[PDB]
Design a protein around this ligand. Structure first.
Ligand SMILES: COc1ccc2c(-n3c(=O)n(Cc4cccc([C@@]5(C)OC(=O)NC5=O)c4)c4ccccc43)noc2c1
Ligand SMILES: COc1ccc2c(-n3c(=O)n(Cc4cccc([C@@]5(C)OC(=O)NC5=O)c4)c4ccccc43)noc2c1
Lengths: 277, 277
């Protein structure tokens, strides 16, 4: 807290540290994603998926990350897309864990508490980050190479047609807050350091780090958004919305798998892609 | 304790008006509840119900809110307790409604939105307020004249066995924040004015009132708890725990509605449970 206000030095160093770590861990930033979604893409437009024919072409042309399960699982599109999101979600776990280790104090916590914080936090972070690739009309696919429309995802078979809708509804409201990457970098760090996680052995250093992160975010929002009145409080309220998407996703995994006979892929693939959904 | 600034001054006057209305609307405050639970063991001492035998001995001794004149009971302990809590929730709706009308701007809102704010606000408030009446060992009952143990409530017949546990678990963590009646007045007003409720016609006028309630809650907590670093952020995150209790209570009632065909549900609560998520 050396001059400027004061209490604008250790907190500003923490804010900048997280921002740099976030840029390093998550290459597709909100800034880069918005440029594509608004049309400032520098005439390098993403491939649009609006129906089955465009999906078929994108798989051959762009060669998406979800083209792979055309050798282990069924040809059913709705199942391939749903499992593809599951595969990306498990891939994201590693990006989030690398980011978490860069949070001052996180590596010094009890090894079991680190596992617990990442286990319950990753899903809340996935949905927060997913908002950055979404607008009212769709979502950016595979590193911004494609754009899958909201209508196409809604056109999907009986249980799968409603899977992306809760994330779209949240995204529209979360995006109205108009946060940028430097804001998100601190918000995701606050999510990880949640002291109410079940099975936590030593809550004290967790809440101590989170309180320091909350102070850094409160300041970040006041400096970057002076006109957005209670932006900090409004953002904290969105953690209710995040937790609800997570609880609803768990309900869907119960509706499917206990109605879905089309298996869950190769035994080794099933093992790699479990729990982190 | 504003100390200059006409902005801080308006927020203090708002905090003052809300605390005033809360005292007028809710007869059993947290302050009174704590005085009964802790020290002052004279005319304030409650009768303790810890087993089936003590419950029977209690009805004959002190005339509680569950043993009113004429056949209005159920002639079965587990159901009788649950029905009493159901009737108390109806009375609480009248108290919360009275308090809701005192929040500046609430009565000015579209009538349909006034109904939706209360439909969803009610249960989250009952549970927040109920924490004031609890400790880890039990709950104050019949206007603080009695005290029912957590263990006697946990030991009830099969469908009612777990019924109070999510409330007691929430109360333990919520009570750890050490909020007083003056903080609760603002927080419950913040809960009612939730712009993210389903079916709201005009979100913007609700959000504007909530923004001002959040500003008044932030100042209140900083002045009343200056040694409690991020109390405001910790309090806003508890709104997630509130939502989960509601979801479980509703799920619990669906089971009761099927297994207990002869148990009546109040129309007022039936309208509340209706299109609830
Ligand atoms: C940067 O931080 C982030 C940002 C985003 C995600 C994320 N995620 C995501 O992108 N979608 C939308 C989507 C839709 C369709 C196909 C695909 C994929 C898998 O299939 C395809 O062909 N391209 C693909 O990307 C992806 C998700 C949908 C659901 C859950 C997580 C999703 N998981 O983890 C993340 C980390
Ligand atoms: C705004 O402040 C508040 C404060 C509290 C409540 C509240 N509530 C509550 O008090 N309990 C605990 C309890 C336990 C046992 C018996 C009884 C009663 C009803 O039955 C009996 O025999 N004696 C009794 O008091 C009451 C609840 C339990 C469940 C739901 C709501 C409950 N509903 O609404 C409120 C508004």
């Amino acid at each position: 807290g050396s001059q400027l206000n004061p209490e604008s030095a250790d907190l500003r160093a923490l804010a900048k540290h997280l921002y740099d770590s976030y840029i390093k861990s998550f290459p597709l930033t909100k800034a880069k994603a918005r440029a594509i979604l608004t049309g400032k893409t520098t005439d390098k437009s993403p491939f649009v998926i609006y129906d089955m024919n465009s999906l078929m072409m994108g798989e051959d042309k762009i060669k998406f990350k979800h083209i792979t399960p055309l050798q282990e699982q069924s040809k059913e599109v709705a199942i391939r897309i749903f499992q593809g999101c599951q595969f990306r979600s498990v891939e994201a776990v590693q990006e989030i864990t690398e980011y978490a280790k860069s949070i001052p104090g996180f590596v010094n916590l009890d090894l079991n508490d680190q596992v617990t914080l990442l286990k319950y936090g990753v899903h809340e972070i996935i949905y927060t980050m997913l908002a950055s690739l979404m607008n009212k009309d769709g979502v950016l696919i595979s590193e911004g190479q494609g754009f899958m429309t909201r209508e196409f995802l809604k056109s999907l078979r009986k249980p799968f047609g409603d899977f992306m809708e809760p994330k779209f509804e949240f995204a529209v409201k979360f995006n109205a807050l108009e946060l940028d990457d430097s804001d998100l970098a601190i918000f995701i760090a606050v999510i990880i350091l949640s002291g109410d996680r079940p099975g936590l052995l030593n809550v004290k250093p967790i809440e101590d780090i989170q309180d320091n992160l909350l102070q850094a975010l409160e300041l970040q929002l006041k400096l970057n958004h002076p006109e957005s009145s209670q932006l900090f409080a409004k953002l904290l309220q969105k953690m209710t919305d995040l937790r609800q998407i997570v609880t609803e996703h768990v309900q869907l995994l119960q509706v499917i798998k206990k109605t879905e006979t089309d298996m869950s892929l190769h035994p080794l693939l099933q093992e790699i892609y479990k729990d982190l959904y």
